Amino acid sequence: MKIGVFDSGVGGFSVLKSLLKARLFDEIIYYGDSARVPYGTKDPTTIKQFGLEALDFFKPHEIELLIVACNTASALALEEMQKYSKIPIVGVIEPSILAIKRQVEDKNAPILVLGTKATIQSNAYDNALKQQGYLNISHLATSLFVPLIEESILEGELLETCMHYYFTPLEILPEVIILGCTHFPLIAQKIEGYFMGHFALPTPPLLIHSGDAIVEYLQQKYALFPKVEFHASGDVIWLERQAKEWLK
Amino acid sequence: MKIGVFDSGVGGFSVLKSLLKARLFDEIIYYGDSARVPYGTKDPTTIKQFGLEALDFFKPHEIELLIVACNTASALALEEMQKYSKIPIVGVIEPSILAIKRQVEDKNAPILVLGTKATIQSNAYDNALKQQGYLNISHLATSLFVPLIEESILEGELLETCMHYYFTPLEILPEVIILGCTHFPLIAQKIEGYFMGHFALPTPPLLIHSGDAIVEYLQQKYALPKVEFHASGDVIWLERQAKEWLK
Ligand SMILES: O=C(NC[C@@H]1Cc2ccccc2CN1c1nccnc1F)c1cccc2[nH]ncc12
Ligand SMILES: N[C@H](CCC(=O)O)C(=O)O
Numbered sequence: 001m002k003i004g005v006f007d008s009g010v011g012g013f014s015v016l017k018s019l020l021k022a023r024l025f026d027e028i029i030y031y032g033d034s035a036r037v038p039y040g041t042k043d044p045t046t047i048k049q050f051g052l053e054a055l056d057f058f059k060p061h062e063i064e065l066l067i068v069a070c071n072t073a074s075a076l077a078l079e080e081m082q083k084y085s086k087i088p089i090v091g092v093i094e095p096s097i098l099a100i101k102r103q104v105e106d107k108n109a110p111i112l113v114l115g116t117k118a119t120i121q122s123n124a125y126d127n128a129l130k131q132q133g134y135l136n137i138s139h140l141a142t143s144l145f146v147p148l149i150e151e152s153i154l155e156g157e158l159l160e161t162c163m164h165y166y167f168t169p170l171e172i173l174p175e176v177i178i179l180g181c182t183h184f185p186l187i188a189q190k191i192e193g194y195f196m197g198h199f200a201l202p203t204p205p206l207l208i209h210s211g212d213a214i215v216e217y218l219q220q221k222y223a224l225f226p227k228v229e230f231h232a233s234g235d236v237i238w239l240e241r242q243a244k245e246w247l248k
Numbered sequence: 249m250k251i252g253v254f255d256s257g258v259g260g261f262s263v264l265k266s267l268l269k270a271r272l273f274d275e276i277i278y279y280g281d282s283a284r285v286p287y288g289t290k291d292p293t294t295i296k297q298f299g300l301e302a303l304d305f306f307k308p309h310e311i312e313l314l315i316v317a318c319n320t321a322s323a324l325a326l327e328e329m330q331k332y333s334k335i336p337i338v339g340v341i342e343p344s345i346l347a348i349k350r351q352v353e354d355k356n357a358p359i360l361v362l363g364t365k366a367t368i369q370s371n372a373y374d375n376a377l378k379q380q381g382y383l384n385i386s387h388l389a390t391s392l393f394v395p396l397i398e399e400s401i402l403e404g405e406l407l408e409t410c411m412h413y414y415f416t417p418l419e420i421l422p423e424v425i426i427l428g429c430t431h432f433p434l435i436a437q438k439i440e441g442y443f444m445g446h447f448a449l450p451t452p453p454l455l456i457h458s459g460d461a462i463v464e465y466l467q468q469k470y471a472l473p474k475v476e477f478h479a480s481g482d483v484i485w486l487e488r489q490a491k492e493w494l495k
C-alpha cells in the first residue's frame with residue numbers, strides 16, 4: 001500500500017507523525033506546497049485551485065489514497081478535489097468529527113474550534129458539529145499561531161501573550177478544544193496550561209488532535225517501517241530539514 | 249508615463265502610498281502576488297522564479313518602468329529580472345543606500361538593517377553599505393512583524409512583546425534603522441518609541457523608509473493618477489486592503 005500526504009507546507013508533519021507511528025502503510029509520498037504556504041490567510045477561490053493542482057502532482061506517483069493533512073485545504077478544497085479524483089481523498093475534518101462523537105457524549109458541552117482564518121470563515125467544523133447534534137459551539141481564528149510555531153516559538157512570553165490576545169475575549173469557557181490546524185499540536189500543552197491557569201480549572205479542556213483522529217478513522221477502514229518520499233514546491237531540502245524537527 | 253509596481257502582496261501599498269503622494273506618474277499598474285505571499289520566509293531559488301514570473305505579468309501592459317516594491321524580491325530576484333528586461337527595473341534597496349549616503353555623513357554611525365529572513369540572509373543591504381564605506385552595520389530578521397502587521401496588530405502588548413523579543417539581544421545602539429521590508433513603515437512610530445525608551449535617547453533614530461527613498465531616487469534620476477490593481481489571489485481582497493494601507 002502506497003499513499004500520498006498533501007499539505008500547504010511543513011505543518012503536515014504532525015499528521016505524518018501519527019501516520020508513521022500507526023504503521024498502516026508501506027509507502028507515503030509527502031508533498032508540501034511550501035512555495036505558496038500559508039493557505040489559511042488566503043481566499044476560497046485560490047485555495048480550491050491549490051487543491052486541484054495538488055491532485056496533478058500525485059498523478060504520476062500512482063497512489064491509491066490521498067490524505068489531505070491540511071485543515072485549511074480540507075475545509076475549502078476537499079469537495080472539489082473529490083469530484084476530479086478517482087482515488088479516495090480523506091481530509092482531517094470529518095475524522096475529527098467522528099472522534100468528537102466518540103469522546104464527547106454531552107451535546108451541550110462547550111466546544112471551541114481553533115483554526116486558520118480561512119478554516120474558521122468556511123464554518124466547516126461548525127456545520128459538521130451542528131449536523132451531529134452539538135448545540136454549544138464556539139470558533140476562533142488564531143492566525144498568528146501558525147507563524148509563531150513555524151519560527152519555533154513554542155514557549156515564553158511571546159507565545160503566552162499571543163494566547164492571551166486570542167483567548168481573553170472568549171465568552172464561554174471551553175470543555176473541548178479542536179486543534180483544527182496542522183500546527184497547533186506543537187503548543188497543545190501550552191494551550192491546556194493557559195486554560196487551567198487563567199480559569200479555576202483543575203483538569204484541562206479536552207483537545208482533539210487531527211492526526212490522531214484521522215488515524216483512528218483510517219484504522220476502522222484498512223488493515224494492520226514505511227518508506228517516505230518528501231516533495232516540495234519550494235526547496236525540498238528546506239522542507240526535509242523541517243521534517244526532521246517536526247517528526248521528533 | 250505608465251509604470252508597474254510589483255510586490256508579493258499588499259505590503260507594496262506602503263511604496264504606492266509614497267508614489268501617490270509625490271504625484272509622479274499618470275498611470276500605475278500594481279500587481280500583488282497575494283496567492284503566494286510571503287516571499288521572505290522562502291528560499292532564493294523560489295524567489296528568483298517568482299521575480300521572473302512577475303515580468304511575464306507586466307508584458308501585455310506596456311509599462312515603461314517596473315518598480316519592484318518588495319524588499320525581498322529586490323534583494324534576491326532583481327539582478328535576474330534585469331537580465332531579461334528591456335525596460336528599466338528599479339528595486340527598493342539601492343534607493344535606500346543613496347538616502348543613507350545623503351543623510352548619514354559619519355561612517356561610524358551604527359546602522360541597523362531590519363527585514364525578512366531572506367532579505368537579511370542575502371546581505372544585500374550590508375554589502376551595499378560596506379561598499380560605500382560604512383563601518384558599523386548590524387542586521388536583524390524580524391520575521392513575525394509581517395504577519396502581525398497583516399493582522400493589523402499595530403499597537404498593544406503583543407506588538408511590544410514581539411519587538412522586545414527581536415530587539416533584546418541587540419548589541420549596538422543604532423543611529424539609523426533601515427525599514428528593509430514593505431510592512432515595517434506601518435509600525436515605524438512604535439519602533440522609534442521602543443529604541444528611545446530602552447536606550448534613553450533624546451531624539452529617535454533615523455528611520456529609512458523604502459517608499460520615500462525610491463520616490464527621492466526616481467525624482468533625482470528622472471527629473472520628474474490612475475491605479476489599477478491586480479492580484480494572483482482574490483483581487484477584491486487586495487483592493488479592500490488598498491483602502492486601509494493607502495490611508
Ligand atoms: O536523510 C537524512 N538526513 C538528511 C535530510 C536532509 C537534511 C538537510 C539538511 C539538514 C537536515 C536534513 C535532514 N534530512 C531528513 N530528515 C528527516 C527526514 N527526512 C530527511 F530527508 C536522514 C537519514 C537517516 C536518518 C535520519 N534521521 N534524521 C534525518 C535522517
Ligand atoms: N496547513 C494549514 C496551516 C498552514 C497554512 O495556513 O497553510 C492548516 O492545517 O490549516
Ligand SMILES: N[C@H](CCC(=O)O)C(=O)O
Pocket residue numbers: 255256257259260285286287288289317318319320321363364367394428429430431
Ligand atoms: N514584501 C516583503 C514582505 C512580505 C513577504 O515576505 O512577502 C518584503 O518587503 O520583504
Ligand SMILES: [Cl-]
Pocket residue numbers: 149150151152245246
Ligand atoms: Cl518547529
Ligand SMILES: [Cl-]
Pocket residue numbers: 397398399400434492493
Ligand atoms: Cl494594516
